[PDB]
C-alpha cells in the first residue's frame, strides 16, 4: 500500500538500479518529471512530463522546496517533484531514484522515509573489481567521490554495504530493501 523510495549511492549504483528494476518489474517504479517547456505534439502530459504551462509557478515551487532536483536547459526548467515521487510511493511501488545525497536529505525532510543505501568501496582496487567496465582514470574519481560522500552524508544512509564482487554488493542491497520494506 505504501513503498519507500530507494536511492542507491556509491559506485555500481546505476547497475544495481538497473538489475533490481530488471528483476522485479512489478515491485519498482519510476516517477514522472516536470518541465516548463511547451509539450510536443506526440508528447503526453502526465507520462513524458507534467508540463507546467505557467513557468512562474514552477520557479516559485522550486523556491518552496517542492523539488528534490532541478536545472535549466534551453531556458526551460526541469525537475523531479517531491509529490511526483510520493505518487509512485502510493501505488505500492518502490521509486528508484538517480539523485544526489542532498536530494536524499530533502526526501527525508519531507518525512517521505526513503531507503538510502550507500555502497562503500573498500579500496581503489575494489573499485576496479566490483565495477564491470571502467578504466583506472575513472576509478580514482569514483573512489575519491565515494570517500568524501560518506564523510559528509553518513547520517542520512539507511545502510552501508560492501563486497569484493558486485554480486555480493547486489545481494546485500536486496537484503537492505528486504529488511526495511515491511
Amino acid at each position: 500500500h505504501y513503498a519507500r523510495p530507494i536511492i542507491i549511492l556509491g559506485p555500481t549504483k546505476d547497475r544495481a538500479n538497473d538489475d533490481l528494476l530488471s528483476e522485479f518489474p512489478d515491485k519498482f517504479g519510476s516517477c514522472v518529471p516536470h518541465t516548463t517547456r511547451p509539450k510536443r505534439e506526440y508528447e503526453i502530459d502526465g507520462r513524458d512530463y507534467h508540463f507546467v504551462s505557467s513557468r512562474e509557478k514552477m520557479e516559485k515551487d522550486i523556491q518552496a522546496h517542492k523539488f528534490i532536483e532541478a536545472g535549466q536547459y534551453n531556458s526551460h526548467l526541469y525537475g523531479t517533484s517531491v509529490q511526483s515521487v510520493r505518487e509512485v510511493a502510493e501505488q505500492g511501488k518502490h521509486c528508484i531514484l538517480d539523485v544526489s545525497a542532498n536530494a536524499v536529505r530533502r526526501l527525508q525532510a519531507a518525512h517521505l522515509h526513503p531507503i538510502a543505501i550507500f555502497i562503500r568501496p573498500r579500496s581503489l582496487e575494489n573499485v576496479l573489481e566490483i565495477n564491470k567496465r571502467i578504466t583506472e582514470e575513472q576509478a580514482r574519481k569514483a573512489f575519491d567521490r565515494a570517500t568524501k560522500l560518506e564523510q559528509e552524508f553518513t547520517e542520512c544512509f539507511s545502510a552501508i554495504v560492501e563486497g569484493d564482487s558486485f554480486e555480493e554488493i547486489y545481494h546485500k542491497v536486496k537484503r537492505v530493501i528486504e529488511d526495511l520494506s515491511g
Binding site: D14, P33, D48, E69, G71, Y73, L77, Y78, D98
Partner: peptide, 12 residues
C-alpha cells in the same frame, strides 16, 4: 535515471 537527454542536461 531519466531516460531523456533534456532532463539530464538540465541537471548538469
Amino acid at each position: 535515471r531519466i531516460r531523456r537527454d533534456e532532463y539530464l542536461k538540465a541537471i548538469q
